[PDB]
């Protein structure tokens, strides 16, 4: 990559004044012995009892490709459904002028791995210099909290090995 | 012409003036052969789709 | 509505999904707001589902169609069903394709 800025897509602290935007920790993913979650995300949850619709679009105003990343979260029980969005018939859009997909959360029992019985699925997708990307949630949607505009630099790969830079 | 194989396949109506023999050894498309899915959204194994119509 | 594949050779069909921008646009097309199409052959079979959204606009649109495309084999049935969303084919193609060319990108001049 010839350039690589990463920047606040959707500020955490303005984006979501009707959905809770603290309790998306997790045990799975602890900071300091402390439930947390991943910095670039944010585990959207129910704000009191309420999970209004969502929606949120960024466009690309930053002359580069953005590579925006977001999750979809599939809880283990319908309980688990209740208790993070209240709804219990959920969806999520992303759509761009190149991407369109619309999410249907997978409600069962998976094996417990890292403590968890239900799944996160993560998804990207590069938006061009101009374009939208617009969210669309009713529930289970890890939204984006920080993008990066990129210029990607031919083609390098990946060396894996302990030896010392 | 100025169509690519999306826009000539789907019948864009840029391309209807083109002749479509009944037989072809290769496809030639210009490099601003643009003229395609005038109605945006994907094309679904486009070019799967190209390489099985290439002749 | 279906179609039998009489022309002793393969058949192109194409045909599109579209997915509006808003429930509005939704009913002011089709009316049925819950719709679904489906497409069966002996060897093809989707299930396809409207996401409706508002999508940046392109060429004017918020909405999005998808395309899609199946070979029917001599002799076999290919199904359409839908209650909405669906572009269907109006012209198909029956084609005899051979080995396997490619697709030069060049202004040089036939």
């Given at each position: 990559?010839?350039?690589?800025?990463?920047?606040?897509?959707?500020?955490?602290?303005?984006?979501?004044?009707?959905?809770?935007?603290?309790?998306?920790?997790?045990?799975?993913?602890?900071?300091?012995?402390?439930?947390?979650?991943?910095?670039?995300?944010?585990?959207?949850?129910?704000?009191?009892?309420?999970?209004?619709?969502?929606?949120?679009?960024?466009?690309?105003?930053?002359?580069?490709?953005?590579?925006?990343?977001?999750?979809?979260?599939?809880?283990?029980?319908?309980?688990?459904?209740?208790?993070?969005?209240?709804?219990?018939?959920?969806?999520?859009?992303?759509?761009?002028?190149?991407?369109?997909?619309?999410?249907?959360?997978?409600?069962?029992?998976?094996?417990?791995?890292?403590?968890?019985?239900?799944?996160?699925?993560?998804y990207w997708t590069l938006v061009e210099p101009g374009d939208?990307?617009?969210?669309?949630?009713?529930?289970?949607?890890?939204?984006?909290?920080?993008?990066?505009?990129?210029?990607?630099?031919?083609?390098?790969?990946?060396?894996?090995?302990?030896?010392?830079? | 012409?100025?169509?690519?194989?999306?826009?000539?396949?789907?019948?864009?109506?840029?391309?209807?003036?083109?002749?479509?023999?009944?037989?072809?050894?290769?496809?030639?498309?210009?490099?601003?052969?643009?003229?395609?899915?005038?109605?945006?959204?994907?094309?679904?194994?486009?070019?799967?789709?190209?390489?099985?119509?290439?002749?």
């Amino acid at each position: 990559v010839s350039s690589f800025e990463r920047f606040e897509i959707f500020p955490k602290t303005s984006s979501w004044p009707n959905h809770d935007s603290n309790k998306g920790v997790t045990a799975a993913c602890p900071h300091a012995g402390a439930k947390s979650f991943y910095k670039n995300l944010i585990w959207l949850v129910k704000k009191g009892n309420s999970y209004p619709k969502l929606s949120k679009s960024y466009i690309n105003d930053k002359g580069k490709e953005v590579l925006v990343l977001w999750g979809i979260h599939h809880p283990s029980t319908s309980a688990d459904q209740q208790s993070l969005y209240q709804n219990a018939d959920t969806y999520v859009f992303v759509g761009s002028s190149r991407y369109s997909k619309k999410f249907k959360p997978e409600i069962a029992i998976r094996p417990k791995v890292r403590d968890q019985e239900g799944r996160m699925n993560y998804y990207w997708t590069l938006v061009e210099p101009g374009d939208k990307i617009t969210f669309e949630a009713t529930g289970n949607l890890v939204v984006p909290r920080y993008a990066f505009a990129m210029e990607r630099n031919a083609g390098s790969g990946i060396i894996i090995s302990d030896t010392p830079v | 012409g100025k169509c690519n194989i999306a826009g000539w396949i789907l019948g864009n109506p840029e391309c209807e003036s083109l002749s479509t023999a009944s037989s072809w050894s290769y496809i030639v498309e210009t490099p601003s052969s643009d003229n395609g899915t005038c109605y945006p959204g994907d094309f679904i194994d486009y070019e799967e789709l190209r390489e099985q119509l290439s002749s």
